[PDB]
Paper text:
The overall structure of CmnC shares similar folds with canonical non-heme iron oxygenases. The catalytic iron is bound by the 2-His-1-Glu facial triad comprised of His148, Glu150, and His295.
Five high-resolution crystal structures of CmnC in free form (CmnCapo) and in complex with l-Arg (CmnC l−Arg), l-hArg (CmnC l-hArg), α-KG (CmnCα-kg), and l-Arg/α-KG (CmnC l−Arg,α-kg) were solved at resolutions of 1.49–1.83 Å. The complex structures were obtained by socking crystals of CmnCapo with proper concentrations of l-Arg, l-hArg, or α-KG. The extra electron density was identified and unambiguously matched with the soaking components, l-Arg, l-hArg, and α-KG. The superposition of CmnCapo and the complex structures, CmnC l−Arg, CmnC l-hArg, CmnCα-kg and CmnC l−Arg,α-kg, shows relatively small root-mean-square deviations (rmsds) of 0.105–0.168 Å for Cα atoms, suggesting that CmnC does not undergo a significant conformational change upon binding of l-Arg, l-hArg, and α-kg.
Residue numbers in the entry:
A (entry chain A): 1 to 338
B (entry chain B): -12 to 207, 216 to 338
Amino acid sequence: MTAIREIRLSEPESAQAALLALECAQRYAEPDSADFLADAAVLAHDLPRAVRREVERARLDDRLHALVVRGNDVDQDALGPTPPHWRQARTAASRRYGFLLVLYASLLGDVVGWATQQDGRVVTDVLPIEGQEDSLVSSSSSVELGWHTEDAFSPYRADYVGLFSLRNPDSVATTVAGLDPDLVGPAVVDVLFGERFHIRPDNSHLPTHNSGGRLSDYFAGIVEAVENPRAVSILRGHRDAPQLCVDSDFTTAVDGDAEAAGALDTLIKHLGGALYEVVLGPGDVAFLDNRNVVHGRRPFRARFDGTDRWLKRINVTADLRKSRAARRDAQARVLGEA
Amino acid sequence: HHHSSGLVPRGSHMTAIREIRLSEPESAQAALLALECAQRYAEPDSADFLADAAVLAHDLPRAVRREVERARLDDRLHALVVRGNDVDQDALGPTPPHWRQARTAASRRYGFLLVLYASLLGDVVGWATQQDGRVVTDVLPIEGQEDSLVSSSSSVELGWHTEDAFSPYRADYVGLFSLRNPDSVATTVAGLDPDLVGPAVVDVLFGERFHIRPDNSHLPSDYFAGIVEAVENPRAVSILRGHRDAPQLCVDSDFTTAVDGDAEAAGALDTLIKHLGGALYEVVLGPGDVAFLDNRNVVHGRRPFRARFDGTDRWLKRINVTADLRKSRAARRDAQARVLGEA
Ligand SMILES: O=C(O)CCC(=O)C(=O)O
Ligand SMILES: [Fe+3]
């Protein structure tokens, strides 16, 4: 209904947001520099008032699918070519969009990264990588990004996933679905509320999607969660507004629970059909409510000529304090550094 | 009457107290925002105001917002104290004789300001079983409840505790806005210094070896069934939680016991009760002073004091703040409602 909340920036609101981002770029080294992240929540208060009003309505809407902020300024000429790999995507020209993504995000909560994702960067990159066309990770193209709750396996999974589209010349859709409980059956719902499923870390948490020199110890937690998954529910909270936690490629029923394996089969067919498209054009920022929706990305053909689709991505928590056991120190934002 | 802020240590807790002193212009700016809110919105906890409160709070003085944000992310904070807000004592009128008479037109602006400060730290919540589910509550002495074990006490020690220690929906912060305090009556505060306790005791306190039962406050429904089960069939819980370097504390000096037959846990618990009792210090809020206690880090209580019941007694506005409103949705009526156990 209001499941998708959209704000289209006026030209002045777009210009004001860009100016704030560019002041941040002048002051701080990286969009996830510790001194910037300490200051971000209060810097975000200087974003346009009309934007702050609508973000706050989104934040307290427990039936949100996504907040979409359209029409941020992106200078395509100044940005330069789409990097061929996330490792090379921390470009001088792309800093300003990282800073703006963190400012928007800091209206919804606190930004976090993962020790086991893109070398523990808090601002990450989504771009097609040659040789990953058919992979199950966000650098895919030819094969759909299978729908998932972000970091479904983890009790420290984000409350919001933020995406800042820098470029999307072929209008490739982000896919989104919620679960209408009164639509699969209060029978299947009860089975999904039961701690009767295994959810494993997706392939982006593997050493193979990180730099080779990363501490083996960062991946201890990921390997444990692959080998010995905890028995967990797919639904939780109030029955009038249950939260969703499932990954289409990394969820199984606990072996010998055909009632569970039956409900999961049913959920996977349902959500696959229910998946709807949101197209993020250049300058469009989305925050997906990761408690309410699964998301993915349509298949596309990458041209690998520097013109390809490029997003900046961020994880947002409503409650940074709750993850302190998994972080190095109070201010550190990288889950699994502890 | 210049802006200042700093860190006041207590024992080995180097950032225990974060103190902010408003300049006259910062005081006036906060007061004008609160007064504008009181003109535009029904109540300090009406749906119209709470939907906007987190954004209206961005209009508080910038220097105060930066220092509050530093407090919010300080996982070793005991108390954030903001001193020097305007209270017009003449216009406020006498301290009401009961909380049921305390939601006065004259005191609205102080409820609004408490919610604005609170909304810099998180989202305000109340409890169906406390002061009729009001989010902005009143702390004042009630004639005939001098010997009481609730915040309306005076002659008797309010025994110290984590706020709502039994509950998974317990506040992350307890906020207090002092309207008057002529006799400088204190809130007592204590955190755990792991350096003053045997590591073996600390190891036991991290164990799920304890029962934390609700005060009789709670108790009257799927919510209230959970309260009865919390008294009769209490879950086994830990007292310390999270990172060894920055553990959260959850204990109630009157309502915590070790699990049946766990003498070692009974020993660790009473070692902790003696430690916190010995480590208690005091925070006094003068008129216009606001405090947020980090309920994840400290227990709090109150010393004996002498109430006059003549309209001059100590009066605070009080609020519960959560870092994560969404996690309590099963215990609230609808998305925007802030009253725990209202559904
Ligand atoms: O490319 C997209 O639109 C989605 C990316 C994504 O889901 C992700 O990287 O987590
Ligand atoms: Fe994703």
